[PDB]
Amino acid sequence: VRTNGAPDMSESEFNEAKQIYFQRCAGCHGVLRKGATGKPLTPDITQQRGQQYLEALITYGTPLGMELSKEQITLMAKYIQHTPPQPPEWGMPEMRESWKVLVKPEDRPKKQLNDLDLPNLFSVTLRDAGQIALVDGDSKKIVKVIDTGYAVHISRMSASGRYLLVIGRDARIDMIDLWAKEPTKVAEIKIGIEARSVESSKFKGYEDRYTIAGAYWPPQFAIMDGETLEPKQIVSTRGMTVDTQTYHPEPRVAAIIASHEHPEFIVNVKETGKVLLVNYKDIDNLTVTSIGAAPFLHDGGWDSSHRYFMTAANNSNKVAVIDSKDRRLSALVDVGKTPAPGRGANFVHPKYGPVWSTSHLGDGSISLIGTDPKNHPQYAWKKVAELQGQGGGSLFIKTHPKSSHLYVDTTFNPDARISQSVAVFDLKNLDAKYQVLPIAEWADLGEGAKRVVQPEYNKRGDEVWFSVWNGKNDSSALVVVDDKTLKLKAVVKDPRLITPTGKFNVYNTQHDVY
Amino acid sequence: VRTNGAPDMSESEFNEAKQIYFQRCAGCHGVLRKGATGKPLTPDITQQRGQQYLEALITYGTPLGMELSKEQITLMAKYIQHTPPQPPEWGMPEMRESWKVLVKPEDRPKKQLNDLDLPNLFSVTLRDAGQIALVDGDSKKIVKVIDTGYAVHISRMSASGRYLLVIGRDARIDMIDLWAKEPTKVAEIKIGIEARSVESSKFKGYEDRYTIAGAYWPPQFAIMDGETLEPKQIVSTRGMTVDTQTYHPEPRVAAIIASHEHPEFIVNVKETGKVLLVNYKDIDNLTVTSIGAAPFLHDGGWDSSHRYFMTAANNSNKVAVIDSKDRRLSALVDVGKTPAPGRGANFVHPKYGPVWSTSHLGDGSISLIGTDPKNHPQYAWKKVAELQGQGGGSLFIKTHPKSSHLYVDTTFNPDARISQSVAVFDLKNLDAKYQVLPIAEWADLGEGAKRVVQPEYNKRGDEVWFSVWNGKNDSSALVVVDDKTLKLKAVVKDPRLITPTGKFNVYNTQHDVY
Ligand code: DHE
Ligand code: DHE
Ligand code: HEC
Ligand code: HEC
């Protein structure tokens, strides 16, 4: 057991110094030792550190985000310097053992045990901390900090409006009961090594029946019981591509959305460019429909009518329209460079009719795609208009049926001021340019990167919440703006609020209000 | 580039001395250098041969079944001594290039151009020769010897009764027109590295629309146009198992049968134990239903009513009943050791009603499973009776609706006499023991292994054809018996008849007459 220029020793040691890498350095440091937003563990940045320094750093840790014997550390040190490993296959045993039922279905209350205005609660992600903050929308006070998995990507609500599903990027799901005295974890499970999406069944006759979770590694998605989180089925997404029709060993599972028209899960499988329609009717025998879209599928959401899944194929610069009723690809609308909608933004255009919008990453723009074939067939599935935001590097854009301004964030732009503000449009005059809201400046944080991410409204549609994403150590905040006035309403600040990313309003998430 | 005790040299050479192994030593010598019925190429039987002898043997060949420069031979010699390789991924380019249209659909005749009694022709496989013999059923004369791929496993008829599909174990399919002056190849294609089954669409509204072929390597099946053999879709079978629900990197595609009730292909995926129902309605978007059966699925066939696919799960010692109408697993009937039906044998029992039978490999016996839930529900999906053949190592068993004797071969039994004869039962008295027919002795071949394989009837149901499978060099024959008399009718002998294995009667294969 040898690499291209670092300590080489054999056997057994390879298998174990790497099983110790996937211990609690799997989700933190990556699958192929990548390491987004932190400093890399790629063979060369680490070989430069050395056989002496690496032992030291692993042994005492560091103060920005750091149990093992001297022998296991000497190991990890000579072995992170080695050729990159063979990522484990996470099957049913590994998944059924990680399954822990913290509270039984009968032990759980029949009705609410708190004064909490549940539909107006915010499930805020605390990335680097590996927890979620249950912030109140009126009092602007953190009601409860719950211990979850690492870097909770998204939070989904169980259609009923009772349970809160949260998934870590380390593939650890946690179910939370919002009806308990103090809302705490009632079930947990690890569905892979690295994941992104969790989702519950939301069709007519199944509200909360099954829970699905998509994984980045292994290329699979796992279906569970939507009450106890009991693994029932696991399906591999390894297969042939849509473009070149060739084999691909790692087609990652991206976004998932429950079909409201049929008993299915609409699963975005990235690299292959196939949107899977996973029928659950008969679960011990799965029926999957492989709808070819466009390569590199990513995020997206529902249109105004909950019929069309508007997904972004980012490295193809197209938006795929999935018809959830007729179960086919409606069109591959060509949009600008690297589209990134999140769930998207739905409003009613005066001169074009009901639309769905998306901000971009390579380009800027906000493409307006028509979502109505019945009353506006000449505009549906075309980039009819086009608006212009501050610049590239945009992740989300938001709107609400209650009132008027359209918000587009720009989290990853090199221009400091742009990456610390949002472009607010007025729908009642689209030819009018945006108003730059100094979100991060209003926060009064002082020093840091102060990146502005995700515009998330409250139930009522009067407030718009922002996350000022700043380093683990730096002062981070949540900025609340009044939609009608366009002025600052409040700033939620706290040291427990370590790296706030995604904020999910319970009602708005549950009823898909975007 | 080094192994555990043989010449080691680097780079480039690994990739090429192995691309030359998959040249024309892929189908002949195996995927992982296995090598059924010939002497192995496993690292140790070959390392013992030596760096000097291997160069010699590859350079001059041998007289029992054997272009490259001295450098490429020196290569192959140092490199077959190396660690076993990384089997290529055969995608769409490699498959679309291998596609050759030898005759256009318009160039082909509107009606027959020969005196041939097409429904009573035998497509006989000549294994080691890599060809098929079109033997006549009345005159017992080879009408045409056609050049195909290596070791043509099965031969399937296009529902119409016009085209003859033949697939090599080297995954080379060849379509043959039986209406041409001299029936020759009208289309060919290579769908993988190693395959077994080919099949055409046989449901009500699709007779000859699409052609499917299952592969052992890569774990996939390819769907083509049933007229021109145009690759349209390729699907990977790599996935989770049914028993332990764990990942498996090589679930081999075994038997395939076209559903006569729905627009589907019933695909047996071995290792995973999943019987796939591949819907073709909309081909650019495939709907697959994963019906869990029992691990290690293999062969099988239809019942009397063409409704139930009776497949054998050999290393599970069960027979899975697939309902092609209601689209579910009907039952997992427990049978004896290592079941091997082929397509099976269907007859009407006097005291139990319509049944399906299967001979075995580990055990002997012929298990009788009831195939009627309507008139005989108390016997359906149970091993009601049980008959006894000569011994273990049995591959096929046959019967015909016209007349009375049931034949069970035994090709792989150590007892020479047993492996050279067939057990003939009388259905009109099942308590009566079998009559041992000295098939290979009647052939008058003299020296050899003289293995008896596959009882195949003629259209009329009066003759029963056997294949006396003897070595490439030895004298091989086809023995024809008269079913009514149980005596010898004729013996087809010829030197072109090198290793006769599977004999397929055109009408009997087409209309699934077993
Ligand atoms: C597949 C996917 C979804 C859709 C889920 C769904 O709705 O079913 C999604 C949505 C999301 C949403 C959902 C918002 C919504 O309301 O729609 C949030 C909060 C979010 C926070 C982040 N995303 Fe996300 N995102 C990825 C994956 C995804 N992001 C990546 O792979 C990527 C590009 C790289 C990575 O490092 O993981 C990435 C980076 C980020 C971030 O950097 C964020 C800001 C911080 C973080 O935690 O990593 N992503
Ligand atoms: C999956 C499969 C089928 C069903 C196809 C269908 O109907 O869709 C089948 C049927 C068949 C049938 C179909 C007969 C029928 O009418 O049902 C034939 C002729 C046949 C000749 C052989 N079979 Fe076969 N057979 C395999 C695979 C299969 N055999 C193997 O993998 C195995 C065990 C090992 C191997 O070496 O390939 C194997 C060995 C053999 C032989 O040794 C035979 C006698 C000679 C040869 O050519 O290799 N198999
Ligand atoms: C588990 C056995 C491991 C291994 C192999 C390493 N880590 Fe971590 N790591 C993480 C963070 C946030 C940092 C950056 C902040 C800081 O250093 O304070 C790091 C950095 C490292 C390095 C050094 C990088 C360099 O400068 O070259 C190395 C060699 C390293 N880690 C190895 C995060 C985490 C955790 C997230 C809380 C956890 C747990 C781990 N690391 C675990 C391990
Ligand atoms: C392609 C580049 C190759 C390689 C690597 C080899 N063969 Fe063949 N082989 C086949 C048969 C039928 C035999 C047995 C009969 C006989 O030897 O006459 C063999 C045997 C070998 C051996 C030697 C086995 C031993 O005694 O140790 C080796 C080293 C070997 N082959 C290498 C069949 C075929 C073919 C089927 C017609 C083809 C073509 C190839 N072999 C091609 C190659």
Curated annotation (Swiss-Prot), chains A, B:
PROSITE patterns: CYTC (PS51007). It catalyses: nitric oxide + Fe(III)-[cytochrome c] + H2O = Fe(II)-[cytochrome c] + nitrite + 2 H(+); A + NH4(+) + H2O = hydroxylamine + AH2 + H(+). It is found in: Periplasm. Keywords: Electron transport, Heme, Iron, Metal-binding, Oxidoreductase, Periplasm, Signal, Transport. Homodimer. It is an enzyme of class 1 (oxidoreductase). SUPFAM superfamilies: C-terminal (heme d1) domain of cytochrome cd1-nitrite reductase (SSF51004), Cytochrome c (SSF46626). It comes from the Bacteria. This is Nitrite reductase. Binds 1 heme c group covalently per subunit. Binds 1 heme d1 group per subunit. Heme d1 binds at residues 153, 196-197, 216, 343, 454. Residues 8-86 form the Cytochrome c domain. Heme c binds at residues 25, 28-29, 49, 62, 66. Its cofactor is heme c; heme.
